[PDB]
Amino acid sequence: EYKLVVLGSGGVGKSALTVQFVQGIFVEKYDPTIEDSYRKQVQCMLEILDTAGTEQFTAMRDLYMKNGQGFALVYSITAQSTFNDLQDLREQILRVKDTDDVPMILVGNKCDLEDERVVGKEQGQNLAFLESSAKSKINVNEIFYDLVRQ
Amino acid sequence: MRMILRKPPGQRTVDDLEIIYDELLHIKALSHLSTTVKRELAGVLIFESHAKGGTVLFNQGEEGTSWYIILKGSVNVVIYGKGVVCTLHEGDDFGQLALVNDAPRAASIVLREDNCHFLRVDKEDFNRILRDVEANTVRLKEHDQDVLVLEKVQKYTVMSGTPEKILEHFLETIRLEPSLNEATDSVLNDFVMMHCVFMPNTQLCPALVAHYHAQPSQGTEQERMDYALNNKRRVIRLVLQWAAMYGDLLQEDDVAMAFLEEFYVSVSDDARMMAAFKEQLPELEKIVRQPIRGSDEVLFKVYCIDHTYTTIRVPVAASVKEVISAVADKLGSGEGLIIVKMNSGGEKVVLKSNDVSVFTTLTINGRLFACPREQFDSLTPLPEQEGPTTGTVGTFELMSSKDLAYQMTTYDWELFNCVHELELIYHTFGRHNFKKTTANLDLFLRRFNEIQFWVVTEVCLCSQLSKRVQLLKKFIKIAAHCKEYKNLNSFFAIVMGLSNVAVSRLALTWEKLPSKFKKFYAEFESLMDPSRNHRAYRLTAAKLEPPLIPFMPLLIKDMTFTHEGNKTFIDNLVNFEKMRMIANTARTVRYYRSQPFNHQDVRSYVRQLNVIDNQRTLSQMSHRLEP
């Protein structure tokens, strides 16, 4: 059993990634009210805890951080604000967990659109790192593979 | 052969049955069927012939008695108000809709040319042989464009379609019969609740008018008068369900109210002529903390960088653009203002001009600011946003755990009942897309955070350790009483407040707590286990009876993931499977409020909480209480 957590600001594609990993948009209908909604098997079972839609509820991310074991720090490349927001979340994990080091991954979602892009690759290099895309299936599985390794 | 197929079912010989079956193997409409079903059809398929082009096979609005397969020739599919919608040719079949749904014919079938031959299966034989196997997926076409997809998942349900065709289908299949009075109020409910996503009132109201006045083009005078009357009765049912759904919210829609006032006059005038609508006209006459309306006005303070402010008078549903204009009015401006939300912790968000009803989307201690873009980074919070500096233990410690929980649940119920089912829809699909307020939902969702931070605030403002252990004991008790009243929302809010980093840190406080309450809390903390899609909570809430307040953040999550997980449009048609899913989740709230719920000093405290929502402040307070 493993528990992975998807963190980030709104409009970043957290939910799009989660569904695209566990099941897939369009190909099948997505029911988020059943036991296996966020569970997938890869040989180990993954439970994705996503803060999508609950961002205003600070207690919800904390509960997810406490139960988590791997963390996906997702941002968008169409929004300057979202990479700036990642500093706080990084530290907030290292306070609920009460540990010194936590296995995590940085994710730069929405790479498929370059004509609207305002952020660069440069910024996320130093703090793994992917320029994934949920809607274009780029690096979707990669995100959740790395966390199980770590 | 034709004489053979004209013979009644119980008159055909074994050799007749064998020769027919061979021919059924050449019909593509029957190719998907099993050998068992096909030989049952050999003794059931009647041959029918008509010579004259323009002969009407059946009328729209008639009860369906037969399913047809075209051998020779072609037919027109005619729908009232549209005329010839499409043509069916050699090898095509029709008429299964009325038989499966037990509903009137959705269209008229008229001969296109001379000398047409049909294979027919009557009602009793269709239900026995074909009902479970024939036409499980039906995609209707109009002008060579796909217009509706029905699937047998027992009647057909709408999988996808155009807004117009979906409405047409839901009208046609309204059950008028008095014994079936709630079995229709549940089928229509999906459409009535969800239409605003794919067919707003600007389209729906004209469509309803056109449907109400649509006359039949087929049948004798009596037949036509009957078809039109039932059509009119069905439209009225829809309008009643639509008006009931919106309730007081119609005041925000001038088009919807103008329609309802004109519709009522039309029904009244028709009732004076036809002596009908006796049951439905008086019901239509009735329609023609309190919930906040979008048309209500607020006196809202918008602050400048120097911390002076302007009080603006605008509607609750006003856009950021209207807010900017109101500030620019009072201050006198042509200097490019932006509106920005700010937290107690200095965190800032620039609001788009597009954003509507932003006043209630603020954090507990958030304020609204107006400034040019270059002032953005220099903005600093108001002292008022930082919350209280002394506790209120002296006040609420003198109050009963049971009384606090009761007054909390009473107040939570007032707030929960103020929320409209449609506000959940607007919130999910995005406020700006509807220009409607979600103010009632926004304030009720905010209360979760208010209760959470109340706990953290009071614990962190309690300097005496012995009293702090008494606080933890009290909050645990208040949480337990909230769970008894089936107020699961406030229950989880208190437990999460206890789980806060600032509170959980206090080892000397937690250690000195009786093992009874340490046991209690451990059970509460396991109820919020996220494992297997919050299985622990979901089962707890499933056991409970109707009058209950659900864990709201999880409801919002379900709603978010239904929307992002599923597409609204498939193949350019409305994905009604998705619409149905959203509707079920919203009706979940209707189920929770279906039953009613069973000390002015205690009422006052609970409804006027003062809270620190600045996490950094609360941590600093905690770190000086127990280093």
Ligand SMILES: Nc1ncnc2c1ncn2[C@@H]1O[C@@H]2COP(=O)(O)O[C@H]2[C@H]1O
């Ligand atoms: N676009 C369409 N709308 C309605 N009915 C159609 C359409 N195309 C074909 N039909 C067939 O016409 C039949 C008219 O009677 P039923 O409602 O029993 O079943 C209907 C369908 O089988």
